[PDB]
Amino acid sequence: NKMEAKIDELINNDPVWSSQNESLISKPYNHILLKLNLIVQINRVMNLPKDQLAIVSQIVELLHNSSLLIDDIEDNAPLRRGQTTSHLIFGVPSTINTANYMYFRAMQLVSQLTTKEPLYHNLITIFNEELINLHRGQGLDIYWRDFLPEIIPTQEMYLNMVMNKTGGLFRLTLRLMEALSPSHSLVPFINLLGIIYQIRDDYLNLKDFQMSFAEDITEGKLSFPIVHALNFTKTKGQTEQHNEILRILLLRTSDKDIKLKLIQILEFDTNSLAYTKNFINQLVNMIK
Amino acid sequence: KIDELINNDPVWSSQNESLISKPYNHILLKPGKNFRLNLIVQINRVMNLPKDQLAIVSQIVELLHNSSLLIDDIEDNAPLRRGQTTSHLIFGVPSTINTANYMYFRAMQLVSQLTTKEPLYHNLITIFNEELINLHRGQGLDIYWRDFLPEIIPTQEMYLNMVMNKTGGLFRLTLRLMEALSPSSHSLVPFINLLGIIYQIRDDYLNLKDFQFAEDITEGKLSFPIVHALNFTKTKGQTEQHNEILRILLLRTSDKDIKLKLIQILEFDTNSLAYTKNFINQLVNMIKNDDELLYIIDHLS
Numbered sequence: 090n091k092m093e094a095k096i097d098e099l100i101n102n103d104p105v106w107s108s109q110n111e112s113l114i115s116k117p118y119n120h121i122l123l124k125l126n127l128i129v130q131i132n133r134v135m136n137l138p139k140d141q142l143a144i145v146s147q148i149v150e151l152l153h154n155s156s157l158l159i160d161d162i163e164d165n166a167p168l169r170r171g172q173t174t175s176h177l178i179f180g181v182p183s184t185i186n187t188a189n190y191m192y193f194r195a196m197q198l199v200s201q202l203t204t205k206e207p208l209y210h211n212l213i214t215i216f217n218e219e220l221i222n223l224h225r226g227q228g229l230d231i232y233w234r235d236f237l238p239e240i241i242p243t244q245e246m247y248l249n250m251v252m253n254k255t256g257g258l259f260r261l262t263l264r265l266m267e268a269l270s271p272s273h274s275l276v277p278f279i280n281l282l283g284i285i286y287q288i289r290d291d292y293l294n295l296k297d298f299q300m301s302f303a304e305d306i307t308e309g310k311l312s313f314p315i316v317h318a319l320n321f322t323k324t325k326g327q328t329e330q331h332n333e334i335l336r337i338l339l340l341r342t343s344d345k346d347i348k349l350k351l352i353q354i355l356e357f358d359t360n361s362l363a364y365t366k367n368f369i370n371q372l373v374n375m376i377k
Numbered sequence: 378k379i380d381e382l383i384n385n386d387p388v389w390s391s392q393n394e395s396l397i398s399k400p401y402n403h404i405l406l407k408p409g410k411n412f413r414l415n416l417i418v419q420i421n422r423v424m425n426l427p428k429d430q431l432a433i434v435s436q437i438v439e440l441l442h443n444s445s446l447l448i449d450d451i452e453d454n455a456p457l458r459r460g461q462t463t464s465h466l467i468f469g470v471p472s473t474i475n476t477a478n479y480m481y482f483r484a485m486q487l488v489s490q491l492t493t494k495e496p497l498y499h500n501l502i503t504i505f506n507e508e509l510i511n512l513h514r515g516q517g518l519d520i521y522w523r524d525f526l527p528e529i530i531p532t533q534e535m536y537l538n539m540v541m542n543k544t545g546g547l548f549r550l551t552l553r554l555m556e557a558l559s560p561s562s563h564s565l566v567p568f569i570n571l572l573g574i575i576y577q578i579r580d581d582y583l584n585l586k587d588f589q590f591a592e593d594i595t596e597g598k599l600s601f602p603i604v605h606a607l608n609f610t611k612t613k614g615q616t617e618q619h620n621e622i623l624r625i626l627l628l629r630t631s632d633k634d635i636k637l638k639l640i641q642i643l644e645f646d647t648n649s650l651a652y653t654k655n656f657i658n659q660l661v662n663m664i665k666n667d668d669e670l671l672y673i674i675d676h677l678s
């Protein structure tokens with residue numbers, strides 16, 4: 090019965106959770122937090138009050154960091170923002186569970202934005218829609234890469250993947266703000282802006298290496314230049330090169346000279362770097 | 378072509394949908410006792426939700442539950458789930474995590490298909506949000522104790538709080554969504570919390586008893602019997618046996634004989650197996666000594 094009492098008390102109450110518990114399981118998240126402007130700027134138009142703007146800000150921050158914690162496990166990444174990734178320190182189990190926990194903490198914050206039911210429902214749909222989009226994008230990035238060469242994407246498939254994957258959070262942010270604003274949409278603009286951002290991330294991962302980690306190569310990522318290279322070689326009948334690009338991706342190698350060979354193939358043999366640099370310029374042009 | 382791309386919603390073919398769904402379909406094809414699904418139909422005898430809402434609640438629960446197991450198997454380095462290879466060993470940890478997470482959000486999406494009524498809708502989202510937060514808290518504690526061992530040896534009380542969060546979470550999510558949708562005029566949450574607790578201690582018990590592959594040992598999990606053995610040896614200054622329990626859990630061993638040795642210690646030295654069997658019977662007695670529901674539990678004794 091002394092036991093009966095405690096059980097009775099246990100089951101008749103909300104689950105017990107302390108501030109110490111909160112701290113112990115937030116470790117992976119506090120670590121990446123150790124490593125926006127766009128929102129402040131975009132507000133000039135949206136015109137959201139400050140405390141509301143700060144909530145949008147906390148929300149995208151939780152979602153952005155959480156998704157990187159997961160992405161780094163997915164991409165076997167050793168470094169993020171110059172430091173060791175959380176999963177290498179705290180382990181994959183803790184990191185995944187904490188990142189997932191923060192997605193739900195983020196969701197909780199949405200209700201602090203409003204109570205107006207029409208509005209709230211729309212804010213939730215936005216949150217739910219773009220998170221679904223991010224996972225669809227991520228899922229293809231990962232599938233193409235881990236099942237290569239089962240599927241060789243075309244430039245169009247890559248752009249659609251990116252629209253899902255990178256576009257998700259850019260669209261989530263803008264859409265939360267548009268819907269909260271007293272008042273055409275900026276979604277197509279944010280879309281092009283995310284496509285650019287992603288292709289540039291892809292490009293810079295290789296070019297900063299060619300001039301002075303090229304980790305995407307160790308990941309085996311179907312980046313924008315790799316996708317161009319793989320379709321170019323197939324289209325020009327460069328069988329040997331097409332296969333060698335496939336083989337180096339599949340090695341998941343950290344060897345610097347092997348990574349450099351691939352980058353120089355993209356440089357001189359397929360011209361993918363130039364093509365990618367140009368492509369970025371043209372998209373940036375569509376705004377100029 | 379750019380214009381048309383950025384002025385449309387992102388593309389998603391049913392073919393893509395099918396690619397991403399594989400890790401999930403993989404676990405879906407290996408059944409279970411459908412325990413939660415069955416519990417739902419029963420309880421609806423008293424909740425009386427219209428059949429369509431009952432289908433949606435069941436689906437949300439099925440998605441949450443199966444995805445949660447896909448992820449738990451990654452967190453637990455599990456080679457088998459429901460007598461079949463785990464999804465992360467086939468499609469890899471990366472796709473498996475992403476797909477499980479994707480399904481959490483597809484379960485969320487189904488919540489707005491439950492109701493138009495914006496007042497009711499707010500509460501359903503809150504229920505969904507709160508129990509997913511609770512599920513992750515219990516799971517984070519279970520993982521923390523295991524991966525930081527021997528930094529913190531949980532007490533029986535801490536274990537029970539961890540279980541109320543971890544296993545009680547989806548049981549409470551199920552019941553609360555239904556009490557909230559019920560057109561019918563106390564609550565079953567306390568009952569569903571006890572069930573959850575029984576259910577988890579029994580899982581921990583069965584993983585060691587059916588052996589005595591006792592994967593919980595390989596995992597190094599702070600299961601109920603193990604929590605009992607460590608707190609016991611600890612209480613009676615049994616330094617050496619306590620340390621040995623700790624050494625075997627820390628080996629993360631797949632050794633049949635070493636696993637056997639630890640089971641032997643819990644059986645013959647701390648007597649944790651019988652302690653757990655008796656603890657489960659007492660929790661069942663609280664219920665059965667307080668109707669389809671009445672059977673269900675007895676079934677768990």
Ligand SMILES: C=C(C)CCOP(=O)(O)OP(=O)(O)O
Binds near residue numbers: 160223254290
């Ligand atoms: C914001 C999200 C979820 C996309 C991250 O994908 P990537 O793997 O392409 O991004 P990086 O690791 O290069 O930052």
Ligand SMILES: C=C(C)CCOP(=O)(O)OP(=O)(O)O
Binds near residue numbers: 170255286287
């Ligand atoms: C959104 C993508 C593609 C990955 C993260 O990019 P960022 O370079 O913006 O990541 P942080 O600056 O926050 O490290």
Ligand SMILES: C=C(C)CCOP(=O)(O)OP(=O)(O)O
Binds near residue numbers: 410576
């Ligand atoms: C103890 C928990 C919560 C995980 C296993 O649940 P089940 O044992 O009900 O799994 P399935 O029957 O669906 O395989």
Ligand SMILES: C=C(C)CCOP(=O)(O)OP(=O)(O)O
Binds near residue numbers: 453
């Ligand atoms: C899957 C969730 C959310 C709780 C059960 O985790 P456990 O690791 O204790 O369950 P089993 O693997 O024994 O099924």
Ligand SMILES: [Mg+2]
Binds near residue numbers: 160161164166
């Ligand atoms: Mg990455």
Ligand SMILES: [Mg+2]
Binds near residue numbers: 163
């Ligand atoms: Mg990635």
Ligand SMILES: [Mg+2]
Binds near residue numbers: 449450453455
């Ligand atoms: Mg497990």
Ligand SMILES: [Mg+2]
Binds near residue numbers: 449452453519
């Ligand atoms: Mg587990």
